[model samples]
Target: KKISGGSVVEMQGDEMTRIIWELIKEKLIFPYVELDLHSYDLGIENRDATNDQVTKDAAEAIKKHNVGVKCATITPDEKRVEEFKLKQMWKSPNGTIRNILGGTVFREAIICKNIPRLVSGWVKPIIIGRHAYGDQYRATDFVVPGPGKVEITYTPSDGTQKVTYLVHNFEEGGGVAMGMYNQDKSIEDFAHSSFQMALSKGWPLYLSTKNTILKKYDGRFKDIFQEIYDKQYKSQFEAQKIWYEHRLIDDMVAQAMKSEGGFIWACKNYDGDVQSDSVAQGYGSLGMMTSVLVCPDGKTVEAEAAHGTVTRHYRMYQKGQETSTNPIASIFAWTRGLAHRAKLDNNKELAFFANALEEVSIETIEAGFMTKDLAACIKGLPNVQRSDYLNTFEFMDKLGENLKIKLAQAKL
Candidate 1:
């Protein structure tokens, strides 16, 4: 008899990762647990056909079902516009999903002992949470003419008063100016999610901000987190022996460089984007990064690989050339999402199964079984040969064999 697992909003994406997506379900997922996947094709062609409503629908389904496992979708550029012949340049599906979900995006690197990291001292995983809203991402900018006055005005919706604040004055030369703002409610939600995630991981939490420089704007984040930590989350955190602290962005980065790497760092939107890449590269490949969106309530989540659709690999795949693309992050996306589902359903068997799959992926890599990208990390690309690693298909087969062995052992 097939075991019944809870449903998930299975969002399909574009390129090489999409091809591997089906195989993952075939080999790693469907063979073990029976699941109902509420499917949505977020592929470029289908998104263009649906006018991107499919993305919206998928986000809604996630909200309703409390779990979403997404594949990496295409964020169209000019080249993609022509290739896919899109109606218009669509915004990133991730941006749309984040707006709807209103959550913090936490990215954790999947560590394999055999895969040597540039930061060799990082014995534990570093979980970086990006507050995926506001800051420069939503700021407005304008080119200033010579000798111009720049001011920010706020007109009260209640029609009680109007307030205007002088921002800057260009004396001689032309320059650029910007206006940015963040809501207290969103900050509180971000704080809640970060705290919740830290608790879940059983790690200390740190919020990075330039509060000393931008006192009012950035300070608001610091104050809100402190307030929430003291009033709401302090007791639980204390009980868990985990604490929350505020750190300067520069100092946090410096500390992170030398630390053993077992804490969660919550960064403002802009800093997280740049730093996550640095951390990902230092650890190894983007294929080793797993992203999970944890909501304010800490109930709903959407998981995906942090990297983009591998267009070059897809082209090689199209030409019938063998490609050694890494599928670790994609596999983790499934495991992480299913693990969340398992938690919600209180299914120990399902949780064990998800964890076992993840263990098999890591074990396969530790045994010197991996794709080219990881092989490059193990032995420099200059020294990497065809014999050093498996092709994409063979790598998946190896994971399958390892996972099957684990499953059978569990049954025994």
Candidate 2:
């Protein structure tokens, strides 16, 4: 039989994440899409065995297919190095993937009415696009014991523009201070990626920065975005009925707080990391966050759950203790990834299937049949109520069953 859903190359990863990866494939993917899964077991051992070549190959395959849904693996810290007990410590697979793909990382919250948000009243999803390269994430710092001045000078090779800036030094108790810079190329790419994602989703894009404070520093970001908007993406943005605008970071936060959501907010690396966590907590679970990487070329993308593997829950299940782990985000990883593939392949039926799957997830949660994390998000929740939700496998089964019923009812 000819299948409707588009192909998605999946990359599995380490630890407890690997276990959930299986559940995602069995329940969320196989039953819905007759998958042409060019899968790779990116388990820690396998990554080591392949000298991490598998991750590179998988990323290339995603670019070839235009979509990849992945599981969050362990980025080994010093402790992980000791535990793995092997060769030199490997860098993060995500970092490697991002460098090769060259994209903006968008984190979208999954809103459930029953879930309690850290910042309450965030009823709708807030999608965040992080300019994932440069700035504080990559900086040079020094411990100047005395009152020595800090300066950063950028000398142009062509002598077109030469600039220098001085940073402050305090005599009192100190914290972190550093100097960092971004080239025009990266900023342009970042802006293009943000605009592309915005156009694709039909969601307005807001780039938030502390331009007023960091004058030249953040100003570069603001200027680059505006330049790109005018030069490349403004017309398409306007035609899509979506807008791109820069806002002061403070105002952006306030706007986010006041608004009901449904817009994508672009951020610098630090802000994305911090704000994404805030939004995830507000949505009531990291497991409810959907992560998507849209390349600058507006082509390749990789999707995944924002949360790590349910190690604690998995261990509990192993000991015969009932464990109910949230699998919503992991499921959407497949849904959104496939949807992107469908879009790339121009397969409307596949796109419809993907949308149906996402709707099933949202509708199911909103109907009040959710796990403990979300159930507790509702007011007057006493303790962890195991009976209030299905266990990991059971919840996935429910979603699969619901997805089938929804597709059937839609005559799709």
Candidate 3:
């Protein structure tokens, strides 16, 4: 069938991810959906050859095209620079992409019934929509000398009265100081994105901020979200029988600890950084966490696995050792992006295909077939035997086999 969903900007990546990227397209996508892919090789070597213009180009393409599915790429360090003989240490491709995209990154755990979670009470998925811009990420830091006061001054470009806010007074000793900020525009965008995400998922949304403490700073986030919700989303949310609420960061954590996970938690930049790792670990493995970048406009999105390039497994693969790396999250990268595409085009068949792909992956793992990482989550690492899991290629082949079976039945 001719694919009705719009084309996806397929940003390829490095190492084992680069290998599996092709396998996923070949097995799960190509044979089924006829997608127009604007392909870009974002592998480390290609990145070096292009002087990192490719990363910027890919970001621009995503901005224009409105949907991108990326493979995990190498954010090269000193060793990687030497290994690849790079010109300079390039910035993170994901970071560059996010900078251009200007949105919240929502990470969802791909849950399987058979796989046990560390937070055993989490029966449903906790979708984390992280505000990816400003605050600590774009903060300025400096060391303070003895007996110095710190303040922040903002001068209006329109020649309005300048305002200075006192930050700290270092009366006796030396310490470090930092200044961070989030634009009212950015916070408003974040609110729109979070509400849109919750509405789409048909789930309640909670925005966590330290409003009680940082009354001026965090309070802005709370105020903006509330204003936007009341003016824009409240009635639609009511119609859907879902709601949006704000919570204190500490209280939100406590609430999340005991509750069955089914709602979306919108977090500030720093909180998202720390909490996402915790949530990913608790859910089973990073390999099971799927990350999606949803723009404030709720039109554009980029999807990828939460995990990195799997350098450890890639090294083993290079040494001719058998590897059992999980590919579920990576495969979901494609499905999630395509699912968005399906939504954009209103393509039911493509939507059904995307749904079927996800279902079969869970169905396969629940039937006791999975990669090593997931197997370790079930039977402890030392207790897990080779027979407990399929090798990397075997797992993909098995998933492909099951996907075909499920897709065929869906067609029937």
Candidate number of the best lDDT: 1
Model 1 regions lying over 4 Å from their true place:
134-137, 269-275, 278-285
Relative to the unseen true structure, what is the C-alpha lDDT of residue 377 in candidate 1, on a scale of 0 to 100? 80
lDDT string for model 2 (56-147, tens) is: 99888877877888987877677877978757687778777876776788887776666666567776677788766622245566676665
**TM-score leaderboard ranking:** 3, 1, 2
What TM-score would candidate 3 get against the native? 0.95
Q: What overall lDDT, based on C-alpha atoms, would model 3 receive against the true structure? A: 0.86
Model 3: residues >4 Å from true position, as ranges?
Answer: 2-4, 134-137, 269-275, 282-286
| Candidate 1 displacement at residue 218 in angstroms | 1.4
TM-score for all predictions?
A: 0.95, 0.89, 0.95
CA-lDDT, candidates in order: 0.86, 0.75, 0.86
**Candidate 3: clashing pairs of residues:** none
Candidate 1, residue 20: the lDDT equals 92
